[PDB]
């Protein structure tokens with residue numbers, strides 16, 4: 722049906738109705754034991770989420786009109802370069818700093834310039850990344866998404882219309898994000914990437930699944 726309904730349903734299942742965050746945690750714990758048992762990794766640091774709050778902190782980037790704000794149990798901060806509705810904060814995400822030690826966005830001259838680090842259970846890039854000028858700026862957005870996420874939070878990535886998705890999967894794994902869902906909807910590909918319990922775990926996964934010819938960034942032809 723709709724990417725919006727698809728994403729609300731996934732988020733709800735991931736944190737509430739299906740505990741997918743706990744399922745993937747187990748998969749990642751087993752993967753780490755496998756790697757340690759092969760001497761390829763040592764004593765890495767792991768960071769886990771507490772039980773989800775009743776109200777999830779969701780950052781909707783390139784939101785346009787804040788579709789997610791009325792979804793139950795989502796507390797949505799919506800940003801857009803050119804907001805269409807008054808409830809979307811103006812921001813060029815490429816110029817946003819991710820700042821530890823703050824609780825809410827800070828604005829200068831009416832533009833979001835700073836967001837709280839490690840604060841959001843969910844970051845949503847719905848048909849946003851194809852607006853970036855370069856491949857390296859698409860990666861930059863996902864790197865900011867990673868500093869914004871709580872441990873085991875999820876990046877919801879929706880892009881318009883296989884080896885390229887394997888490349889994005891590899892590129893995002895290099896920076897700590899492991900894909901946990903991929904679904905094809907009419908005219909779009911719907912993906913969710915999870916902030917792994919350990920970035921080093923994610924990077925080693927990517928090392929193993931690197932095919933020859935693929936870049937470190939995330940590309941749009």
Ligand SMILES: C[S@@+](CC[C@H](N)C(=O)[O-])C[C@H]1O[C@@H](n2cnc3c(N)ncnc32)[C@H](O)[C@@H]1O
Pocket residue numbers: 724782783784785786800801802803804812813814815846847848849852853
């Ligand atoms: C195709 S619309 C998608 C709107 C909504 N997310 C959806 O799924 O329908 C792309 C949006 O990204 C916004 N955008 C483009 N570059 C941006 C940037 N650098 N920072 C914040 N928003 C940006 C545009 O203003 C536009 O609202």
